[PDB]
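To the structural biology subgroup,

Please find below the input and predicted structure for Reduced folate transporter,Soluble cytochrome b562, which we are adding to the shared reference set this quarter. The sequence is reproduced verbatim from the submission form. If anyone notices a discrepancy with their own records, reply to this email rather than editing the shared folder directly, so we keep one authoritative version.
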Amino acid sequence: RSWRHLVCYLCFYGFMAQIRPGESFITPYLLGPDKNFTREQVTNEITPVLSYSYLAVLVPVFLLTDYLRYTPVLLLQGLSFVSVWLLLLLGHSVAHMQLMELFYSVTMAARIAYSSYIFSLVRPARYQRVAGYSRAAVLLGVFTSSVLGQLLVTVGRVSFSTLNYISLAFLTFSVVLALFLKRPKRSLFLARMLRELGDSLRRPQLRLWSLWWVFNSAGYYLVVYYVHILWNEVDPTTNSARVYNGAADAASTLLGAITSFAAGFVKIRWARWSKLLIAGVTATQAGLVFLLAHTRHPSSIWLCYAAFVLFRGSYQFLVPIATFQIASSLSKELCALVFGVNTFFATIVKTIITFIVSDVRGLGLPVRKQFQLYSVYFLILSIIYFLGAMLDGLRHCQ
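Predicted structure (tokenized):
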């Protein structure tokens, strides 16, 4: 009876908080007529500040989430989103947008805390069903946010400036409703850790999937950060409505959901050979990335959207398998630490790559050549994994 209130309230909060009408339209608004921002500045100054900031912020955020009850950190994330949107609304030059990027990274770092809070608060007896409901609610919220943001403009035909105010309104409702969720009762953060790490390191499947997580995720995220900019380069906005950036995000979310659902049905069956699956998926990703890099004609923008949605979907299909193979080794007590370290390594590799191939004081290539380099990178990863599979087969052939 009483428990119904809390179990519904958590899902409601998650769904409402996921709403952000202008998140998918952030890049077109920066290069919109109101703001005098050139493409070279958007991809060399503003986009690289976010990656550096993420690397600097990820560790303290995760370390502090435990010391404070999870509610303070969730509130901090909700308010940091408000700060980001305020900076975007009143951005006046490159420095302000950098500050905005720094703040955005801060919101990004605390995104993972929500699941841990869900686990800590909900009673263990009824944990699985509640967690499933919460994941469904948050995924539905993410899916509907972009759909609303894009259907407001595409048929409503409102300006970009209005969209930011309308997004700020919901962003304020999110923080207002993020204030009354009850605090976790008790979650306060040792040879056991050392022994567990030593034992876990021996499993080879864990090694392989951890390496894939370190590299392919870094490569995937880099493509995601600058893809919007490439889209803007391909076709300037003749009208503010012909842009379908939000539609692509909604389609990508739907494809990711449907393919992740498929993954769980073959998590064990296809575990007999994993290197071959990795090689195939990475080869398809490399092909799609190259096609994105070489698509130039204005009348092929729909094709570019299709390529990106396929690319994002393909990567999403391979996340559940990695998570399942990694998690089974040890209980949830150490799974969080393993994922944190792995994600921290996936943030250092990205930081080193991006500084060299994106920001000034380096190559500083424009978007097109940067995507060509990313295509070569993915193809090299595919080659490495294909050769590893060939070696393993040479073992099985004899």
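Summary notes: DSSP finds 15 helices and no strands in the chain. Residues 286 and 376 are 8 Å apart (CA to CA).

Regards,
Lab coordination
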